[PDB]
Design a protein around this ligand. Sequence first.
Ligand SMILES: *[C@H](NC1=C[C@@H](C(=O)O)C[C@@H]1F)c1c(COP(=O)(O)O)cnc(C)c1O
Ligand SMILES: *[C@H](NC1=C[C@@H](C(=O)O)C[C@@H]1F)c1c(COP(=O)(O)O)cnc(C)c1O
Lengths: 404, 404
Amino acid sequence: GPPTSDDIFEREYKYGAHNYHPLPVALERGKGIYLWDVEGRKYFDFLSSYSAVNQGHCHPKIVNALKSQVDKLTLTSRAFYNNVLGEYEEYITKLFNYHKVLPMNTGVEAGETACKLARKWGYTVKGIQKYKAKIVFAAGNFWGRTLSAISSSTDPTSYDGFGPFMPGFDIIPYNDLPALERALQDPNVAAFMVEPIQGEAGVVVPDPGYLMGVRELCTRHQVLFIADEIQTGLARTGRWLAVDYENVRPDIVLLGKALSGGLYPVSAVLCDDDIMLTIKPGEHGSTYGGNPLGCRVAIAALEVLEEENLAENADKLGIILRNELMKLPSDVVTAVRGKGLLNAIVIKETKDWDAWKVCLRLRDNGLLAKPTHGDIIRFAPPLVIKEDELRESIEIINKTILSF
Amino acid sequence: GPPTSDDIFEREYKYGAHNYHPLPVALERGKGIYLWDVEGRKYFDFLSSYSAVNQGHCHPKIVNALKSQVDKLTLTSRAFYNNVLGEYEEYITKLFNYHKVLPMNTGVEAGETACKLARKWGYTVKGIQKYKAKIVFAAGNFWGRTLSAISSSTDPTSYDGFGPFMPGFDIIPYNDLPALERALQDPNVAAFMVEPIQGEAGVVVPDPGYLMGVRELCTRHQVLFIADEIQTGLARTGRWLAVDYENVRPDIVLLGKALSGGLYPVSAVLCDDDIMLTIKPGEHGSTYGGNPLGCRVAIAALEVLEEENLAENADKLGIILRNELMKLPSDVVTAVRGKGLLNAIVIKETKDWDAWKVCLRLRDNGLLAKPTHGDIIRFAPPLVIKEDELRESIEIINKTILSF
Ligand SMILES: *[C@H](NC1=C[C@@H](C(=O)O)C[C@@H]1F)c1c(COP(=O)(O)O)cnc(C)c1O
Ligand SMILES: *[C@H](NC1=C[C@@H](C(=O)O)C[C@@H]1F)c1c(COP(=O)(O)O)cnc(C)c1O
């Protein structure tokens, strides 16, 4: 017979690294908003692989894009040209109104690329002496697990024990314009990198006007505004970019995770020529960056986001979701926050009770979510969810919370 | 009409970053050893996307693995389990005889993972004080384009202008056991990372006994031996790992690039428990790392390497290839080097003449290669090439070199 859930757990424990402690559920199929485990049980996906499957699992248009391109060509390396890359580049740059895109594979690779662009621009355009350029980050940031990315983290689990750290990364509080204004007095600062809503930190939504203020301060002090929209972009918050809510144009925009609908690791760095062209041929790249297969998949995923109006659905259904979540009692759920379909609730963590046990019971009742701190539970279903499906899942959430 | 080659070049120039200057050829299909451009012209691929398509372009078994898995499930994130990952992990760990694998996406991500493992092991097992751990690298190394990876590079084009650098990375000459012995006198050294043959540096093959000496010195001084086999592994040099030529077992083995046959970005970090389990749950990861689609593709690519005996083919045909290349005159080709099907020739670069013009003419004559320094031309066709195909390509190379 084929392996049970427990066989799957045990096998991973024996042969795989222990860098994760996942929710004990062994999934097998995903379609749209749904996931099935090896026993056949059906669940709503309320994690969406951290927004990588905004389009729902195995969206048939993106699946067909993958299938059509793999029968053909998948990787030439950028030592030669392929056809697909230029088409995808024109598409995405015109969609987001930037001169150019630099293609990479994973989100952290886009972050690293942004850091390199900011430093190169700082030395060659702003005139900072090599190698005094600084980049400012917001406490609570998460942008990956490289040595550089954990060097900007304030989370000890990300950086503790991981050797000496990248210099030139400063940290200020999130949602704090006076602190940014103070940091940007140093002319050696080249950039400020920030998430428009902090995902991994617990869906931390900054105050209205924060993004506008960030843009104003960055412009005033000749500092690049890098917006990490790898989790908040591509309709998840109800707009193409979360920064669109304040009509703010960052200098560099990072995209990832739903850029492919979960079918391929595709990431993008968007900016104008006076920043992008600071990097000359041979000075940056990636083996799989810009390969034809991922490019086809990304064109298809962006087209799915546009043609199915998923940002508007995210907006309206997130309004419904937060309104319903706020009816849970204050004695158990101390906070409800989010934008569009990126939301979270905060648990009145006792020790009779916590976010992990809540997610276990939610799995028991047919809905999959995972906590991000122990009192924070993220709710982020695929943007293809319909209102009746959302209301049934909300019913599951109510049943689970009021089970305790 | 559909875009010509020149349209493709111009479009990428307008909408894409200028981080590459590729060989002017616009490819469209790849199958096995062959590539076709948009005009219909046919070429031998003698770059193999830097060994990512060891199995040849669009190998039907790996294509079918991709197609079968994408109709199903592609990404749950590691917040939950999927079935495929444990199966792939058991497979690859038993294949290479290590306790465990840590899955990532790109080669540089495997390198970063290795660095984190080495530091965490240095502090928690070797007892180095935080954060004094050092990692030693070999001059000429290339392992990616993150800030940490360019911090260990001796190539100014990789690091110049890219902000202050990661501390704790020391550099010694390649192919130099006395220099390694000298570096390892510092008890704060946690690891030595090295390529068994330096690919990007120009297929630099170290002297016989170098890998044995590295292993002996690392063991003697309680230092981890990290072997980057992302380009040299998976049959390319004629063995499963290039280190197999000296029956050397590194502490950490990095795999990438052919791990997927070019169909998906899949990388792996292999090592035993006493190293791997220094990283605890929540302390490292990746969104796409270990996803089911890439895992299916990787199982298939490894199976193709094993069942088609591609390491033996690489061995014998590389013998033939180097023997034939050495018949070109000394006045034009000053050196021929390599192992298995990873080879290179060195050009007597005049200014009447150089490696770029040679590769242009080779493209004109139906074979695609790219220089790596201006007198170095890499020859690395897919390991599915047959002897008559190889001899025809050698004929192309002769025709081209003796055209000048
Ligand atoms: C990716 N998001 C994160 C990775 C996940 C995990 O595996 O635990 C959960 C988490 F929120 C991310 C990145 C990095 O992208 P990748 O390297 O993982 O592809 C960068 N910035 C942001 C905002 C996010 O969400
Ligand atoms: C990958 N090899 C390199 C990338 C290529 C390019 O785009 O120019 C050519 C070059 F040789 C590599 C890596 C990094 O893997 P990725 O991040 O690119 O996936 C690490 N180590 C080695 C030995 C190699 O070859």
